Amino acid sequence: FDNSTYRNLQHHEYSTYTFLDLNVELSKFRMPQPSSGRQSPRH
Amino acid sequence: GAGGALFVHRDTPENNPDTPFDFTPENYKRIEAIVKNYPEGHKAAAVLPVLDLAQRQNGWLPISAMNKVAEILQVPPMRVYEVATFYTMYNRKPVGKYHIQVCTTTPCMLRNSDSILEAIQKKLGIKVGETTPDKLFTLIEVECLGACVNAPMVQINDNYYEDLTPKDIEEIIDELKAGKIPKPGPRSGRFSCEPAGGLTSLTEPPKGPGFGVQAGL
Amino acid sequence: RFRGEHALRRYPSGEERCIACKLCEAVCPAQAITIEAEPRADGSRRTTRYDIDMTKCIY
Amino acid sequence: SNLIEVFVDGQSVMVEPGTTVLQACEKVGMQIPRFCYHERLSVAGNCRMCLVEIEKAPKVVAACAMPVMKGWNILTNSEKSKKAREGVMEFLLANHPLDCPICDQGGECDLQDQSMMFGSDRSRFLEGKRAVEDKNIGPLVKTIMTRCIQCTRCIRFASEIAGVDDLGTTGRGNDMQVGTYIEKMFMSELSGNIIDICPVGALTSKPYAFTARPWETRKTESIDVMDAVG
Amino acid sequence: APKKTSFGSLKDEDRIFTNLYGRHDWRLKGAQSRGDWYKTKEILLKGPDWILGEVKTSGLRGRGGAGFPTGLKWSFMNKPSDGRPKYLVVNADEGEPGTCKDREIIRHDPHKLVEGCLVGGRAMGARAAYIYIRGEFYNEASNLQVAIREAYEAGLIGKNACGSGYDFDVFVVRGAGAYICGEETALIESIEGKQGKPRLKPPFPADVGVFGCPTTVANVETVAVSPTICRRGGAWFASFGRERNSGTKLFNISGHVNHPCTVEEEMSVPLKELIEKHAGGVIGGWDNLLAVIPGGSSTPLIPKSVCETVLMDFDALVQAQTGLGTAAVIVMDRSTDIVKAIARLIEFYKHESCGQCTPCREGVDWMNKVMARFVKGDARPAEIDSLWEISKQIEGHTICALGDGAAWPVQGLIRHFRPELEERMQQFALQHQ
Numbered sequence A: 001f002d003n004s005t006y007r008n009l010q011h012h013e014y015s016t017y018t019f020l021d022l023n024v025e026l027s028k029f030r031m032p033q034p035s036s037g038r039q040s041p042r043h
Numbered sequence B: 001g002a003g004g005a006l007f008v009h010r011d012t013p014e015n016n017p018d019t020p021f022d023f024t025p026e027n028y029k030r031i032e033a034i035v036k037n038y039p040e041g042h043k044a045a046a047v048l049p050v051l052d053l054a055q056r057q058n059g060w061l062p063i064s065a066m067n068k069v070a071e072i073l074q075v076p077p078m079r080v081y082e083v084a085t086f087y088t089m090y091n092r093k094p095v096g097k098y099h100i101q102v103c104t105t106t107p108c109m110l111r112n113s114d115s116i117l118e119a120i121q122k123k124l125g126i127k128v129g130e131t132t133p134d135k136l137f138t139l140i141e142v143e144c145l146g147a148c149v150n151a152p153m154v155q156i157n158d159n160y161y162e163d164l165t166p167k168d169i170e171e172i173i174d175e176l177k178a179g180k181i182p183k184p185g186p187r188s189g190r191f192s193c194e195p196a197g198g199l200t201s202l203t204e205p206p207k208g209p210g211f212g213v214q215a216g217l
Numbered sequence C: 001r002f003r004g005e006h007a008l009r010r011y012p013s014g015e016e017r018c019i020a021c022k023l024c025e026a027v028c029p030a031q032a033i034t035i036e037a038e039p040r041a042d043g044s045r046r047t048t049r050y051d052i053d054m055t056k057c058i059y
Numbered sequence D: 001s002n003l004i005e006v007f008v009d010g011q012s013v014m015v016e017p018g019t020t021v022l023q024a025c026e027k028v029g030m031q032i033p034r035f036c037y038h039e040r041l042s043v044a045g046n047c048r049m050c051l052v053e054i055e056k057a058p059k060v061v062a063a064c065a066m067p068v069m070k071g072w073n074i075l076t077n078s079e080k081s082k083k084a085r086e087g088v089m090e091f092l093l094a095n096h097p098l099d100c101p102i103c104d105q106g107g108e109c110d111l112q113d114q115s116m117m118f119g120s121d122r123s124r125f126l127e128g129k130r131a132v133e134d135k136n137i138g139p140l141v142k143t144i145m146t147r148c149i150q151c152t153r154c155i156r157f158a159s160e161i162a163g164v165d166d167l168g169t170t171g172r173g174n175d176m177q178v179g180t181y182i183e184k185m186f187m188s189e190l191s192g193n194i195i196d197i198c199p200v201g202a203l204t205s206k207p208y209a210f211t212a213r214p215w216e217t218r219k220t221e222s223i224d225v226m227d228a229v230g
Numbered sequence E: 001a002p003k004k005t006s007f008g009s010l011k012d013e014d015r016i017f018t019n020l021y022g023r024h025d026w027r028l029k030g031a032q033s034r035g036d037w038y039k040t041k042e043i044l045l046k047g048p049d050w051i052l053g054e055v056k057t058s059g060l061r062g063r064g065g066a067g068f069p070t071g072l073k074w075s076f077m078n079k080p081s082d083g084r085p086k087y088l089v090v091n092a093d094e095g096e097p098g099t100c101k102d103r104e105i106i107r108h109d110p111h112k113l114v115e116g117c118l119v120g121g122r123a124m125g126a127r128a129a130y131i132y133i134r135g136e137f138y139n140e141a142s143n144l145q146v147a148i149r150e151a152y153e154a155g156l157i158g159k160n161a162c163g164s165g166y167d168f169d170v171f172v173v174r175g176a177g178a179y180i181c182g183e184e185t186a187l188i189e190s191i192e193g194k195q196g197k198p199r200l201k202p203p204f205p206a207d208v209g210v211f212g213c214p215t216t217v218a219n220v221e222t223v224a225v226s227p228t229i230c231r232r233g234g235a236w237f238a239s240f241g242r243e244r245n246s247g248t249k250l251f252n253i254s255g256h257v258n259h260p261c262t263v264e265e266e267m268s269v270p271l272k273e274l275i276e277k278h279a280g281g282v283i284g285g286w287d288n289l290l291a292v293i294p295g296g297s298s299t300p301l302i303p304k305s306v307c308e309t310v311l312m313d314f315d316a317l318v319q320a321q322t323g324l325g326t327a328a329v330i331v332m333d334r335s336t337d338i339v340k341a342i343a344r345l346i347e348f349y350k351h352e353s354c355g356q357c358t359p360c361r362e363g364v365d366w367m368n369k370v371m372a373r374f375v376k377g378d379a380r381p382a383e384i385d386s387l388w389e390i391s392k393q394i395e396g397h398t399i400c401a402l403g404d405g406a407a408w409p410v411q412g413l414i415r416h417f418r419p420e421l422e423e424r425m426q427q428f429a430l431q432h433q
């Protein structure tokens, strides 16, 4: 057990598209979205 | 004081509706993933991220980029203009390769933020609004960035550099010029939001699962 | 403070001071002032008619 | 039936559910001051000129948006309401240009009239005033945006009545400006109506500019013959 | 024995955020070894009523700054479905100067936030959770997304979310540099692709919220403490702090202190004890202290005479005419220009106003100009009462509480440091004539 080490070093490797890449990967587990019945409020 | 940036658009040879802009196919896949997050019939909710994605591909936001986002999301272009002019992280003008944003709000100003500002100004030879002729740096002052404890702090292209001293910001600028990237975080042997010495709390080993669970659970 | 014959004045540049607001016409107790206005060739707000009937005016 | 009883200055009135404080005050013949509320547009609630005091309530409510509650007592002439109106009028006049003699809205200004009826008679503002650049939205609507009080009536009318989304607000804070953000012409068969709903000289008639004052005009009520609507 | 009197010394066994300093593994494995995601299925199966009752008896109040009772506010969404989906929105904007708690929670304890999202959504009957995180917190947002990814893979969220039978999704949406978007209605508008402008209330988000659907907005700190409260019980959380001020709190002590930091502490700890133990005291000694803003820039400041004996809870600070706010302590010693600090805060508010309503849009800029003149001394003593009246005209007359938070610091400065203002004016007049 060590409490003198900072382990949060992963973000030192995060690129420009890391957040969006994670969003793309997570798009697979999502539940189907609900619908309001229109394509848009202007439809 | 005053913002300085204008909130009308005048066409220029470098920024007009015919300025070439289009998403890359990977960016289109990311756009599909972003759009699928929101309920059907409310695709306009994707204006905020997708616009940012455009800025993440081009560097700034030309008028043609806003038009492309509006056409993709089937939103009136004036709505995208409203969003782009409202939020301060959207770049409606080209910036340098490294956007240096130093906090000058009261918690950061109390810990000598002006010293960091003048050190950056004297190292780069630019003022608080200008871009270096090499187009590598652009220095501006921003409000609180949420790292007040680690004041003075700066932000460079999604990286926080905190606990800054004039020599420290000079060496960070030198490292960024030489083609390297600097390690983000505190720059005073802290690497956390912890007290600068002693660790007054959170020293015992963390308790295991189910330590304090109540009866009947 | 003496009140005599009326006059329309200019700015030191030689431009007229009157902007055709029609406040003097609205306040005139004898309805002695008649004003017509239009945008000038340079877009300035100026009168095209400014009459004072001096036999109506109570000075 | 479904009507609920409310009180305006202690006077009882029966109103439908969902009726706002402003409409309940209108039932007894009282007109609450307004700048952003138009009964044919969507409720905005930004001008804050309609703030009134509800009895036994420490906070004034926006009468144009707040529905009445059963048993409420609207106090339209209390000290709190008058002071709220005076403060809002002061804030609206802080940055307004001293343009009344050259403004076409001169004798027809809701800002002027509500300043005389509900505001103070003096200024304690000792700073410089903001000034914004003008927009060109065509040959019919003259645009002087320094007179704008940011009531967003034109935006709501264009979006909802005219069916066009060309008008909006760019920037934020004291620097928020109403316009198109690009050189665009706001042409529609109903465009000129934005001159009528704009309470100030920020939007005026270009063909009508400087020609007349409202007190000298004679009004004749007639019918239009340019089409078959009448 | 009940009704304690000397609060402010709690051990590590009673700290919810055990990885506040990021000295341990922030990923799923570390959180699981730290007690996270434990008996979540049982808590979900207990039902929304049991979770709402635990939160109600816990005495938890909103950690975003307003201190509204969390149990009643979450129970506001206990209505039967009307055909619209229900959503829980987590406020991770963290725009208040001096406040850095939510950043640490997101970056070092993200699975705590995810589990809190699941538990709160189950209590509210919500269908999914939208976490509106600050745009400048890119790395924190990416860490949160990694945590959500490994929670989806482990089956801790998503379809059935557990061996539970409840479907729940967690989405992360990033803002773009707007402090006003911290406001719940402004946040909701910013999620829907509009300008971050607050809505009028009523309607409340529980009736008409995001996408026009019933919504509950809770800050990251409030949501995170939910699963720990459920597991340990409401009575355990109520055992800390004074009555109506239950539980623990994260404090960001910054400014003129020897060791600025953030720390978990008991609610009713005295300010002097907190500053001198955790932050290392004021540079130059406690007698060097000039002023302290206890709850971020939106709270009025208090002088040394009041700070030496004030408790750090809601009612205690309200009695001191300042308020707890976000529990973000900003300390200034006798070596600072207090008028300049207040002027900088007012300039911040001038730059953060959305401009929707007249009182904020005009009067905050007016106050900024008047305060900038006060800093030099250009003005006259008769303008201090004028500025007080201007602030009173702004306060309570806006759509949103940004006007209140811009007015209160000016009122505090006028109330406690008027002689400094008048002396500055006198010096300016003497040296200018």
Ligand SMILES: NC(=O)C1=CN([C@@H]2O[C@H](COP(=O)(O)OP(=O)(O)OC[C@H]3O[C@@H](n4cnc5c(N)ncnc54)[C@H](O)[C@@H]3O)[C@@H](O)[C@H]2O)C=CC1
Residues within 6 Å of the ligand: E062, E063, E064, E065, E066, E068, E073, E076, E093, E094, E095, E096, E099, E182, E184, E204, E205, E206, E217, E219, E296, E298, E325, E326, E400, E401, E405
């Ligand atoms: N954490 C941060 O970064 C910041 C925090 N703040 C704090 O925000 C505070 C003011 O925020 P407000 O939301 O305007 O206070 P508020 O009292 O009006 O509302 C607080 C919460 O309780 C809910 N609520 C209140 N009354 C309700 C009712 N009758 N029915 C249903 N729900 C109700 C509201 O929906 C809201 O979510 C300030 O005291 C400030 O300290 C301000 C800036 C930044």
Ligand SMILES: Cc1cc2nc3c(=O)[nH]c(=O)nc-3n(C[C@H](O)[C@H](O)[C@H](O)COP(=O)(O)O)c2cc1C
Residues within 6 Å of the ligand: E061, E062, E063, E064, E065, E066, E067, E068, E091, E092, E093, E094, E095, E096, E179, E180, E181, E182, E183, E184, E217, E218, E219, E220, E222, E400, E401, E402
């Ligand atoms: C101008 C303004 C900015 C705010 N910013 C935040 C914020 O960044 N984070 C937050 O949790 N609350 C913020 N709040 C307070 C929100 O109203 C609060 O989060 C919401 O009411 C629910 O918070 P709760 O869970 O503590 O009750 C802000 C309020 C105002 C008026």
Ligand code: SF4
Residues within 6 Å of the ligand: C017, C018, C019, C020, C021, C022, C023, C024, C025, C035, D101
């Ligand atoms: S119209 Fe009459 S009052 Fe107005 S500027 Fe001309 S002379 Fe003066």
Ligand code: SF4
Residues within 6 Å of the ligand: D096, D097, D098, D099, D100, D101, D103, D104, D105, D106, D107, D109, D111, D112, D147, D199, D200, D201, D202
């Ligand atoms: S808009 Fe009204 S107050 Fe402003 S200059 Fe025109 S008439 Fe005067």
Ligand code: SF4
Residues within 6 Å of the ligand: D147, D148, D149, D150, D151, D152, D153, D154, D155, D178, D197, D198, D199, D200, D202, D203
């Ligand atoms: S131009 Fe007129 S109608 Fe449009 S927002 Fe300004 S004051 Fe309102």
Ligand code: SF4
Residues within 6 Å of the ligand: E180, E197, E198, E352, E353, E354, E355, E356, E357, E358, E360, E361, E398, E399, E400, E401, E402, E403
């Ligand atoms: S008080 Fe300020 S920030 Fe809040 S809605 Fe009004 S103008 Fe916008």
Ligand code: FES
Residues within 6 Å of the ligand: B103, B104, B105, B106, B107, B108, B109, B143, B144, B145, B146, B147, B148, B151, B153, E096, E097, E098, E099
């Ligand atoms: S004041 Fe600089 S990060 Fe908040």
Ligand code: FES
Residues within 6 Å of the ligand: D033, D034, D035, D036, D037, D044, D045, D046, D047, D048, D049, D050, D051, D062, D063, D064, D065
């Ligand atoms: S008329 Fe109600 S706020 Fe404008």
Ligand SMILES: [Mg+2]
Residues within 6 Å of the ligand: D105, D195, D196, D197, D198, D199, D200, D201, D202, D203, D204
């Ligand atoms: Mg008009």
